[PDB]
Design a protein around this nucleic acid. Structure first.
Ligand SMILES: [K+]
Ligand SMILES: [K+]
Ligand SMILES: [K+]
Ligand SMILES: [Mg+2]
Ligand SMILES: [Mg+2]
Ligand SMILES: [Mg+2]
Ligand SMILES: [Mg+2]
Ligand SMILES: [Mg+2]
Ligand SMILES: [Mg+2]
Ligand SMILES: [Mg+2]
Ligand SMILES: [Mg+2]
Ligand SMILES: [Mg+2]
Ligand SMILES: [Mg+2]
Ligand SMILES: [Mg+2]
Ligand SMILES: [Mg+2]
Ligand SMILES: [Mg+2]
Ligand SMILES: [Mg+2]
Ligand SMILES: [Mg+2]
Ligand SMILES: [Mg+2]
Ligand SMILES: [Mg+2]
Ligand SMILES: [Mg+2]
Ligand SMILES: [Mg+2]
Ligand SMILES: [Mg+2]
Ligand SMILES: [Mg+2]
Ligand SMILES: [Mg+2]
Ligand SMILES: [Mg+2]
Ligand SMILES: [Mg+2]
Ligand SMILES: [Mg+2]
Ligand SMILES: [Mg+2]
Ligand SMILES: [Mg+2]
Ligand SMILES: [Mg+2]
Ligand SMILES: [Mg+2]
Ligand SMILES: [Mg+2]
Ligand SMILES: [Mg+2]
Ligand SMILES: [Mg+2]
Ligand SMILES: [Mg+2]
Ligand SMILES: [Mg+2]
Ligand SMILES: [Mg+2]
Ligand SMILES: [Mg+2]
Ligand SMILES: [Mg+2]
Ligand SMILES: [Mg+2]
Ligand SMILES: [Mg+2]
Ligand SMILES: [Mg+2]
Ligand SMILES: [Mg+2]
Ligand SMILES: [Mg+2]
Lengths: 254, 243
RNA sequence: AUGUAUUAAGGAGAGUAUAACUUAAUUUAUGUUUAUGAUAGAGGUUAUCAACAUAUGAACUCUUAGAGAAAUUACUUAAUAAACGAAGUGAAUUGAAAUAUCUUAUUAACUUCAGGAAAAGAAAUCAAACGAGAUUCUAUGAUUAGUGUGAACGAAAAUAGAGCAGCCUAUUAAAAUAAGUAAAAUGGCUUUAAAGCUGUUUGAAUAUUGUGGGGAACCUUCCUCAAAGGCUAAAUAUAAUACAUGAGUUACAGAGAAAAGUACCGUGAGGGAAAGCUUUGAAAUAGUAGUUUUAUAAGCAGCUCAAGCAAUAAGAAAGCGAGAGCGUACCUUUUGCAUAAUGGGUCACCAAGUUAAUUUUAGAUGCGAGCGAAUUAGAUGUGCAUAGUUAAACCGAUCAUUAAAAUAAUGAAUAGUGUCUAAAGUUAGACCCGAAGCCUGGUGA
RNA sequence: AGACAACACUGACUAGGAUAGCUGGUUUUCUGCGAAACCUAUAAUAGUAGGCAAUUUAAGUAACAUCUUAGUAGGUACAGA
RNA sequence: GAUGGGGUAGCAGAACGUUGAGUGAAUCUUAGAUUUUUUUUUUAUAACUAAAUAUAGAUGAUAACUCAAGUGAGAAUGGU
RNA sequence: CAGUCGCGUAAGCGGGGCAUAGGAUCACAAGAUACAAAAAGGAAAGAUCUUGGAUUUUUGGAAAAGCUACGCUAGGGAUAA
């Protein structure tokens, strides 16, 4: 079929409430390991710093005087002390600060983005939830933390405990790999929760996600809005002349 | 196992790396494919060097010159103009101007000194259109007019075309009038726009004027000629008879 | 290494609570918060068991009054490095396979002057018949136009980004709008012949009511600007300090310097080290021990055949090896080397086709007559291809030669573009090591 | 006396800025194929370029080699005067 | 019951190893990870078995795939 | 093949000589072509075709004398005693 369904759950209870429809060219693409490779290696090149530096014989300190006479000494002739053959000489072909970045067509990078989403979709590792995706911390703790009654030590020890038993109950913790939460904007509870308990998972903002980030953990828990915005910004090879992008099949039962 | 530990490029994409001077069994050791103690091994030979023999460019010399004043025209064939109208990418009901030709993708994405209509596929072109270009072939003019259309050749420049696409200049297939009897209606037309528009330039050179001044090219200055006048600004049609 | 922020004179000698710094070398006070901090005790030498913020006493000598053999004399509330900037002067190595023009190169270097930056700057600018609108920095344009016999050298318009600011009543105090000037000849510089700089000899005009300059020999029309008077921040350069980042280094690395311009060498200018920690302990080398062989023999010390010795014990033979035979090291360089041709005392470590820009090809792969890039509505941002032909334009699926033309003749027509991997051409140190010499500035009788 | 000018003087020392068609060196393994020391040009003759041509792997083959049969060009050995 | 097998200059293909990086908040380790040795086996520039010695829970080691190179030395009267 | 000339009754012959021994580019000079013309009209300087002047004789094309026993460097034993 040209379109595929996408279930939108309520994050805490994981109740399927709504049903959206996307194109098969969005979440049902074939697995292209060569295209995913070019995108993953393309991001690493741009992340690299590339600032290593070594001195050549033209940059090593000292005078360029001739060390020994050209002949008469019985030893091997020598020029400057900065030669690579000498003790503290310069590395001829040593590292220099340069740009390690490579190029990748916007259309290939957009195909690798939807190919990574399709890899998670066809495997059941893509969970779309309703907007407002945050960890439902207890109201009692939230009331204390704001009040300032709780110390930093206890405040962090509780979040680490609640987040652990919460992820372990959902089978989303360190035992079942990990989970990557993707939201449109930063959320205090979600990001603060996984900043203190990172073994159970992590949280990212849509602007900070990469193709590699969509393949590291065991599942991708993304918001309904972030997914639509993620695919809408990575379909350059498709919208060139549209297809189903968030077509609501079943509305939430208000 | 992990997806990230299973990605690779196609095997045909990978090619052997040759690191020279790294042992005899590599096949490139101890000489790196240079030979034995020659100029090509010690130093470098200039690329233009032939050993001393004079190159042909000297014994024969360079022929001709490169024209630095010729206009670079974008070539458009009727074969392609028909393919666009049928596909629905060019509206034949409206005037086809350079703005619509450039924004259609029929001449590409590069704007040049002008657009010339050529007559490839003139046997199958039967669509009535109203096109305006900088130049046109004698075959294209007949093909356009035979199908029931109109064609006009107007003076353009590389800078005028950019302003047309950018919307800074409005298209017009008529020259700027001359005389104190048109200053009012022209100034009023400018005030009504309420927006700063650049005028399309008119030809200034002898050749450019003569081109758009003759009816063979359907030039937009041909109306300035008399039925017996010549387009040339210097030459005249001689008279026949006994005198 | 880069980026960000802040700052805009540097060193030495001797002395001193040896974390504490100037003969006062551990001065004296204020405010706030103090474990819910900051990021109900003991302790004044058995010390400084308090951090932040704001003040405060002291702070020697020389560079640095004069003089002198700097750290002295003699006086006294004596005091400013480098780098970066502008102008002036201005090479040679090198390349052209020699070499004069050229290139190297408005380079290095030197001198003068100046500030935290300096310089430049609001068109006598560019464009081309449409218009842009000061200066500065970066990229593209551009291995282009063009110059040159060559080798090579090499713009501008425009575009994009960083910054953005205009004025003379200059936010610091200036013009009554500029005459020995513009310009010419001549000698040079720059350079494309224009424009611009200039020694010598000469020498104009007065504003779009078309006066003057420019638009690349030159004249003309038109357009454009208005010299001979000035002010102006930012983006830029350099140095120091702090911080951030790292498929940067981790001790023969990084830096020359993990205690360094010190020790040491040199009359001098100048040259210029070694050296981390409590961990690990390779090779070479030396003295022994165990097993085995060796005093009738002419071994590049290995290989083929192999007696014997070798395990206190059931099981289990590694190693050494008498005797027989084969074998004249290695590398380099050469027609050809055991060669008495080259190089190496041994071992360990350091040590050589790399990077950038540009221009190509193969394979793979994305899109596809488009590719790439970039982007409430609009516009915007290199390039390549899409049509060929000619010296070139007109021309054009046709074009060129045929001094008129004409199937008379001959040649030339159909998928590109981007990326990755790898190999490449070109320019840069260009795979690594090595001269004699040339030039500039300093040092020494 | 080409003598001396602080190891150096037919032109010192020191700092900055080179080239070298010459010599030497250029580091792991396996696999496949495999030359040349000739011609032409050169301010060349220790160099270099273009050919002949080594290699890679595609597109062709009325390919290439050899023999047989028939045919052709050309004057050596020999023999002769 | 396929065909082929010396090799310098040189051209080409396929791999191993070294250092760092990603998967890695992963895997394993006093029931012994790691131990520059010795030993055993396997068509093997490599890894593996076992033994002896010492004793680490991570500033430890590590398969596989991939990325990037200051990546491989009996030869330079080479340097320390 | 086109153009247009000569000789020949005609077929036909004629793009120098019975054959084999005379160097370019660049620059310069003389004719033609109508290509481009740095705002525009012209021009200058260029382009195409024809043609001319060379011990460019080291004749694929530098404007070029010696000494060193005071000599130096890189190499060759690829050429000597
Ligand atoms: K020197
Ligand atoms: K002038
Ligand atoms: K073309
Ligand atoms: Mg070093
Ligand atoms: Mg890469
Ligand atoms: Mg070989
Ligand atoms: Mg080679
Ligand atoms: Mg090669
Ligand atoms: Mg050699
Ligand atoms: Mg050679
Ligand atoms: Mg004084
Ligand atoms: Mg004094
Ligand atoms: Mg020369
Ligand atoms: Mg040129
Ligand atoms: Mg004035
Ligand atoms: Mg003047
Ligand atoms: Mg001038
Ligand atoms: Mg002037
Ligand atoms: Mg002009
Ligand atoms: Mg003025
Ligand atoms: Mg060091
Ligand atoms: Mg170490
Ligand atoms: Mg080391
Ligand atoms: Mg040892
Ligand atoms: Mg005996
Ligand atoms: Mg001997
Ligand atoms: Mg020897
Ligand atoms: Mg020796
Ligand atoms: Mg090394
Ligand atoms: Mg190396
Ligand atoms: Mg290949
Ligand atoms: Mg003498
Ligand atoms: Mg002497
Ligand atoms: Mg063979
Ligand atoms: Mg031979
Ligand atoms: Mg010559
Ligand atoms: Mg030579
Ligand atoms: Mg064989
Ligand atoms: Mg072989
Ligand atoms: Mg061990
Ligand atoms: Mg050695
Ligand atoms: Mg003109
Ligand atoms: Mg010759
Ligand atoms: Mg010849
Ligand atoms: Mg004598």
């Amino acid at each position: 079929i040209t379109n595929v369904p996408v279930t939108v759950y309520s994050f805490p209870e994981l109740e399927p409430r709504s049903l959206e429809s996307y194109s098969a060219r969005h979440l049902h693409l074939p697995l292209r390991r060569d295209i995913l490779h070019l995108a993953v290696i393309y991001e690493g090149d741009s992340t690299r710093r590339g600032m290593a530096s070594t001195k050549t014989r033209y940059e090593v300190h000292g005078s360029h005087k001739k060390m020994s006479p050209q002949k008469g000494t019985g030893n091997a002739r020598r020029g400057t002390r900065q030669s690579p053959l000498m003790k503290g000489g310069g590395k001829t072909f040593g590292p220099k600060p340069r740009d390690f970045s490579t190029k990748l067509n916007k259309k290939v990078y957009d195909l690798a983005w939807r190919t990574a989403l399709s890899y998670r979709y066809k495997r059941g590792e893509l969970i779309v939830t309703e907007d407002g995706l945050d960890l439902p911390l207890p109201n009692d703790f939230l009331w204390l933390a704001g009040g300032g009654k709780l110390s930093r030590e206890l405040e962090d020890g509780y979040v680490r405990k609640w987040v652990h038993e919460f992820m372990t109950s959902l089978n989303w913790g360190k035992e079942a790999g990990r989970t990557t939460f993707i939201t449109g904007d930063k959320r205090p509870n979600l990001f603060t929760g996984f900043e203190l308990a990172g073994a159970e998972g992590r949280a990212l903002e849509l602007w900070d996600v990469d193709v590699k980030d969509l393949l590291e953990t065991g599942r991708i828990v993304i918001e309904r809005s972030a997914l639509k915005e993620m695919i809408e910004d990575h379909q350059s090879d498709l919208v060139t002349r549209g297809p189903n992008l968030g077509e609501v099949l079943v509305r939430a039962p208000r | 196992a992990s997806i990230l530990a299973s990605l690779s490029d196609n095997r045909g994409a990978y090619h052997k790396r040759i690191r020279k001077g790294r042992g005899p069994s590599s096949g490139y050791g101890k000489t790196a494919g240079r030979g034995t103690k020659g100029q090509k091994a010690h130093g470098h030979v200039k690329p233009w060097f032939q050993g001393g023999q004079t190159p042909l460019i000297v014994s024969h010399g360079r022929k001709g010159f490169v024209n630095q004043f010729a206009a670079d025209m974008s070539e458009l064939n009727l074969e392609k103009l028909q393919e666009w109208i049928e596909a629905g990418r060019i509206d034949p009901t409206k005037p086809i101007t350079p703005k619509e030709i450039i924004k259609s993708g029929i001449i590409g994405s590069s704007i040049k000194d002008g657009i010339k209509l050529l007559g490839r596929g003139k046997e199958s072109f039967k669509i009535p259109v109203t096109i305006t270009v900088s130049r046109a072939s004698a075959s294209a003019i007949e093909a356009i007019e035979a199908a029931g259309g109109k064609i006009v050749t107007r003076f353009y420049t590389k800078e005028s075309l950019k302003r047309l696409v950018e919307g800074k200049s409005l298209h017009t297939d008529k020259p700027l009038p001359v005389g104190k009897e048109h200053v009012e209606e022209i100034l009023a037309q400018a005030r009504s726009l309420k927006k700063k528009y650049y005028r399309l330039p008119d030809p200034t050179s002898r050749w450019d004027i003569e081109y758009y001044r003759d009816p063979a090219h359907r030039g937009y200055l041909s109306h300035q000629l008399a039925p017996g006048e010549s387009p040339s600004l210097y030459f005249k049609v001689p008279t026949g008879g006994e005198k």
